[PDB]
Write a structure and sequence with these properties.
- With 292 residues, this protein is of the alpha+beta class.
- Helices cover 30% and strands 28% of the residues.
- The chain has eight helices and 14 strands.
- The chain starts with a helix and ends with a strand.
- This is Bifunctional ligase/repressor BirA.
- It catalyses: biotin + L-lysyl-[protein] + ATP = N(6)-biotinyl-L-lysyl-[protein] + AMP + diphosphate + H(+).
- Its EC number is 6.3.4.15.
- Monomer in solution. Interacts with BCCP. Homodimerizes to bind DNA. Interaction with the corepressor bio-5'-AMP increases dimerization.
Length: 292
C-alpha cells in the first residue's frame, strides 16, 4: 500500500491552525522547501484547505483533529484495529483480508480515496462472523442503536435512527451504515459519520474528540454484536423504540417502483417495519423510508 507518512506528518504540523512557513516546516521535517511545497500539493489533493500567503507561509482555516492510533488503542482492550487515516475504503481493506481476521477486528479512517474531504467524516468498518446469514436487517438495526446510543452519551442528544440503517439529527442524515455478506456467515460492517464541514456534528454545535468516539464505538459495537449473536434482536426492541426518528409519523415507503404511504409504527420482533395503512397494519421487510 502507498506510504503517506510525510503528508500526514505534515498535516499534523499544520493541524494547530496557525501559520507555518516552508523554512519552518522543512527543518522540522528535514528536507527542502521544494519538497514541502510538493507535499502541500498532496494535502490539497485530499480536499484539505491549506491557504498560502506570501510573506507568511501556510495554514489551515481551522485547527483540527487527527486520528491517532496510540490514543485509540490506548483506550481499547483487545483486538486488532487498523488506524489508517488514509485509505481506499475501510470495507475493502477488510474484505481483502477475510482470512486473517476475527470477529471484532477493525479499521478506522478519516478519508476514503474511493469515496468528501480529508477529516470531514469518520469511517469505521468491522468484521464479524456469525455462527449461522441469520441477522442482516436484524444486524443493521442493532448497529444504528449503538451508534446512536454512543453519540448520545458524548452529548449529541437528539440523535435518532432511521429504519433500517441511518442516523438522523434534526430530520437530516448524519450517518450511514452498510452491511456486506460473504459466501458461518462472514460480515463486514461499515459506517460513516458526518463530523465536520445532510447534516454534521459540527453543524449542530457538537464537537467530539474523534479518537474517543472511535474507541467507544468499537468497544460498544463489539459488545453489542456478541449480545446479538446469542439473543438476537429481543434485547434491543425497546431501545429501537426510544430512538426511532419516524415512529408514529406519516412516512412514504418506496419499495421498488412502488410508492406506499402510511404511518410508521416502529418495528416488529423481527426488525420489520410496521406500516399502518388505512387501519391496516403490516410488516415490511425492505424499502426506503422517507418523510412525507
Amino acid at each position: 500500500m502507498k506510504d503517506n507518512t510525510v503528508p500526514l506528518k505534515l498535516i499534523a504540523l499544520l493541524a494547530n491552525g496557525e501559520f507555518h512557513s516552508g523554512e519552518q516546516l522543512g527543518e522540522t521535517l528535514g528536507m527542502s522547501r521544494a519538497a514541502i511545497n510538493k507535499h502541500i500539493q498532496t494535502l490539497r489533493d485530499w480536499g484539505v484547505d491549506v491557504f498560502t500567503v506570501p510573506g507568511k507561509g501556510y495554514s489551515l482555516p481551522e485547527p483540527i483533529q487527527l486520528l491517532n492510533a496510540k490514543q485509540i488503542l490506548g483506550q481499547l482492550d483487545g483486538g486488532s484495529v487498523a488506524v489508517l487515516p488514509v485509505i481506499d475504503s475501510t470495507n475493502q481493506y477488510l474484505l481483502d483480508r477475510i482470512g486473517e481476521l476475527k470477529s471484532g477486528d477493525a479499521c478506522i479512517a478519516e478519508y476514503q480515496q474511493a469515496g468528501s474531504p480529508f477529516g470531514a467524516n469518520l469511517y469505521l468498518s468491522m468484521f464479524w462472523r456469525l455462527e449461522q446469514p441469520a441477522a442482516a436487517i436484524g444486524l443493521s438495526l442493532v448497529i444504528g442503536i449503538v451508534m446512536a446510543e454512543v453519540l448520545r452519551k458524548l452529548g449529541a442528544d437528539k440523535v435518532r435512527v432511521k429504519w433500517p440503517n441511518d442516523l438522523y439529527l434534526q430530520d437530516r442524515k448524519l450517518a450511514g451504515i452498510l452491511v456486506e455478506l460473504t459466501g458461518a456467515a462472514q460480515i463486514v460492517i461499515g459506517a460513516g459519520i458526518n463530523m465536520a464541514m445532510w447534516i454534521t456534528l459540527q453543524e449542530a454545535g457538537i464537537n467530539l474528540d474523534r479518537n474517543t468516539l472511535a474507541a467507544m464505538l468499537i468497544r460498544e459495537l463489539r459488545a453489542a454484536l456478541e449480545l446479538f449473536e446469542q439473543e438476537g434482536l429481543a434485547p434491543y426492541l425497546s431501545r429501537w423504540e426510544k430512538l426511532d426518528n419516524f415512529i408514529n409519523r406519516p412516512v412514504k415507503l418506496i419499495i421498488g417502483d412502488k410508492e406506499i404511504f402510511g404511518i410508521s409504527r416502529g418495528i416488529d420482533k423481527q426488525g420489520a417495519l410496521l406500516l399502518e395503512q388505512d387501519g391496516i397494519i403490516k410488516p415490511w421487510m425492505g424499502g426506503e423510508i422517507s418523510l412525507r
